Design a protein around this ligand. Structure first.
Ligand SMILES: [C][C]N([C][C])[C][C]OC1=[C][C]=C([N+5](=O)=O)[C]=[C]1
Ligand SMILES: [Mn+2]
Ligand SMILES: [Mn+2]
Lengths: 137, 137
């Protein structure tokens, strides 16, 4: 039986700017680095950056909707979004759902998000206003 | 600050087979489904499957090393991997370069992994058998 997410691994084209982005800009903890990757943590999240010459720097119009959302408190959201904006980090979508969300790109075009709110919060909102065809279990 | 992964969203090309894969085959908990997506959990992980006409079924040689690992116990690991094998689930990697792992593909070619062990355990193992150039902080 699966018990959770063990780790998220992102392929990166250049290790140094990716470490700078996740450690310095986003504030994650760097635990180890080797010639072809790094391990960081963000709360319970184990993040691995893996240097991969197959990784393309990918415009957001050229990738699908797969994305990785990080939790932040409502109180911290606006100042963290402003930090990303000051650093020139590109946005790939505007928020139109419940709970604050900021949709931003990593140096290789990985689709990231800051989100405030749990699954339980989302399900409660959906129960009140269900999406088209929605069924609950 | 950022506190962990809020959710993982995977773009899928065909919703029903993807829900079946994550719920029936992998045993995750299905909370809701609608015409364009589904919400599941795996322990604390919030997984969204999002129907996306842009998603392509992607062979593993055509994608980079970005991948998503799920935690499983030492006692359950081998029989779960063998069950996926016997079910015909495609694979993408054989060499255990980061400990006890089974590497398999979802219906759209998302790169998945079963892994036994925490980040702390992997750092301890790496101190003995470090990756080339490895530094610990
Ligand atoms: C997407 C539009 N349609 C399928 C092509 C109808 C939705 O189809 C189902 C919804 C829920 C369940 N269900 O909960 O098992 C089974 C089928
Ligand atoms: Mn999202
Ligand atoms: Mn892995």
């Amino acid at each position: 039986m699966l018990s959770g997410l063990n780790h998220l691994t992102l392929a990166v084209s250049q290790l140094a700017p990716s470490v700078a982005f996740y450690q310095q800009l986003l504030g994650m903890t760097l635990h180890a680095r080797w010639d072809s990757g790094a391990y960081l943590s963000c709360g319970d999240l184990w993040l691995c950056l893996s240097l991969d010459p197959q990784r393309r720097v990918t415009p957001p119009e050229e990738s699908d909707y797969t994305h990785y959302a990080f939790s932040i408190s409502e109180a911290d959201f606006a100042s963290f979004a402003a930090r990303l904006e000051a650093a020139g980090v590109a946005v790939w979508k505007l928020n139109r759902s419940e709970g604050a969300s900021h949709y931003f790109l990593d140096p290789d075009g990985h689709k990231l998000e800051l989100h405030v709110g749990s699954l339980a919060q989302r399900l409660a909102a959906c129960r009140e206003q269900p999406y088209k065809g929605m069924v609950f279990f």
